[PDB]
Design an enzyme around this catalytic site. Structure first.
Site, mmCIF file in Angstrom:
data_model
loop_
_atom_site.group_PDB
_atom_site.id
_atom_site.type_symbol
_atom_site.label_atom_id
_atom_site.label_comp_id
_atom_site.label_asym_id
_atom_site.label_seq_id
_atom_site.Cartn_x
_atom_site.Cartn_y
_atom_site.Cartn_z
ATOM 1 N N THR A 183 4.801 4.402 2.188
ATOM 2 C CA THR A 183 4.617 3.129 1.437
ATOM 3 C C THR A 183 5.138 1.883 2.252
ATOM 4 O O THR A 183 6.137 1.978 2.978
ATOM 5 C CB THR A 183 5.224 3.197 0.011
ATOM 6 O OG1 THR A 183 5.210 1.899 -0.598
ATOM 7 C CG2 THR A 183 6.636 3.710 0.027
ATOM 8 N N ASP A 191 -3.532 6.312 18.496
ATOM 9 C CA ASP A 191 -4.129 6.029 17.175
ATOM 10 C C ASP A 191 -4.670 4.599 17.106
ATOM 11 O O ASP A 191 -4.591 3.926 16.070
ATOM 12 C CB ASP A 191 -3.135 6.317 16.036
ATOM 13 C CG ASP A 191 -3.824 6.482 14.653
ATOM 14 O OD1 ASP A 191 -5.076 6.460 14.534
ATOM 15 O OD2 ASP A 191 -3.092 6.638 13.679
ATOM 16 N N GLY A 248 0.825 -1.225 0.000
ATOM 17 C CA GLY A 248 0.000 0.000 0.000
ATOM 18 C C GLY A 248 0.851 1.264 0.000
ATOM 19 O O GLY A 248 1.645 1.444 0.910
#
Ligand code: IRE
Ligand code: NA
Length: 297
Positions: free
Chosen positions: A29, A136, A26
């Site tokens: 990177t 997060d 993805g």
């Protein structure tokens, strides 16, 4: 009056010649690859993550990831100093838990869902013991080693609390609003108990098989929604017992929210009688996994 102890973690510097990229995962990177160290006759499947203002953030992330060691947290194997700094970590072949629950929505049973909640709470408790606020936590930041074994990752926002410090006070900076505790939105205050708010949102994503929280509501409206007392709704599969846990994670008084160690106990209990708590329809020779590749400390 408690002081601070040394962090004697070893930061391992890997040569670019030791590992082969294979494919992208993805594009920040992230690549899948193979690491073949020293003269060791092992091949270890890895993930490999990669303007001056940004190399500082990737080295803060490497610092945290080098300092954690628990079966439910991802740790750093090492870094490679190229044009751009690369972080190298164990490959989690099934990817992120959010995508995994969306892709296998029709086959995920109550035993898996409850065990994932346990394991995420274990990892988070460990981070709390290390005085780290993750900041997060979300299903996208939990990775799947196997369907029975998940680990927390992405420490880009994580902060180390002083020995007698309750809170991290943030400056500006993007933070995923729909996972944040109300006090973090309004006052930029983060604690272990704000991480527990995020945990409840993460559980909700699991229990809805990967729905988006507050779907279609602009992030800029979330603060005022929460202030009026609205919360994410009861997922269809969830009994009141499971929803109540979620709701408790989203209490305004942070110290009223459950502790990660309590969440481990409560979800462990539910995992022993899973269908009481969730009502769900239809319920290479030398390859070494990085969990069997131990680096002295
Ligand atoms: C097989 O898939 C992965 C294995 C992984 N194994 C280990 N770590 C991953 N990410 C990661 C996270 C933090 C890090 F510091 C480093 Cl070095 C790596 C991984 C990320 C992986 O994929 C991320 C998939 C992201 N999806 C892919 C496209 O769809 C939306 C998001
Ligand atoms: Na059932």
């Amino acid at each position: 009056a408690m002081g601070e102890a040394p962090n004697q973690a070893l930061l391992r510097i890997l040569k670019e010649t030791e590992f082969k990229k294979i494919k992208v995962l993805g594009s920040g990177t992230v690549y899948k690859g193979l690491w073949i160290p020293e003269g060791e006759k092992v091949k270890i499947p890895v993930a490999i993550k990669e303007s001056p203002k940004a190399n500082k953030e990737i080295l803060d992330e490497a610092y945290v990831m080098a300092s954690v060691d628990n079966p439910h947290v991802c740790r750093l194997l090492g870094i490679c100093l190229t044009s751009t700094v690369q972080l190298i970590t164990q490959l989690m072949p099934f990817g992120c838990l959010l995508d995994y629950v969306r892709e296998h929505k029709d086959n995920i049973g109550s035993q898996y869902l409850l065990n994932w909640c346990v394991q995420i709470a274990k990892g988070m408790n460990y981070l709390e013991d290390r005085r780290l606020v993750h900041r997060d936590l979300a299903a996208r930041n939990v990775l799947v080693k196997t369907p029975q074994h998940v680990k927390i990752t992405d420490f880009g926002l994580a902060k180390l609390l002083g020995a007698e410090e309750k809170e991290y006070h943030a400056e500006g900076g993007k933070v995923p609003i729909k996972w944040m505790a109300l006090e973090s939105i309004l006052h930029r205050i983060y604690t272990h108990q704000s991480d527990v708010w995020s945990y409840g949102v993460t559980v909700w994503e699991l229990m809805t098989f990967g729905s988006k929280p507050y779907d279609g509501i602009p992030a800029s409206e979330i603060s005022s929604i929460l202030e009026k007392g609205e919360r994410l709704p009861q997922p269809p599969i969830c009994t009141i017992d499971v929803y109540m846990i979620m709701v408790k994670c989203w209490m305004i008084d942070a110290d009223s929210r459950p502790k990660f160690r309590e969440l481990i106990i409560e979800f462990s209990k539910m995992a022993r009688d899973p269908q009481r708590y969730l009502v769900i329809q239809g319920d290479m020779d030398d390859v070494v996994d990085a969990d069997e590749y131990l680096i002295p400390q």
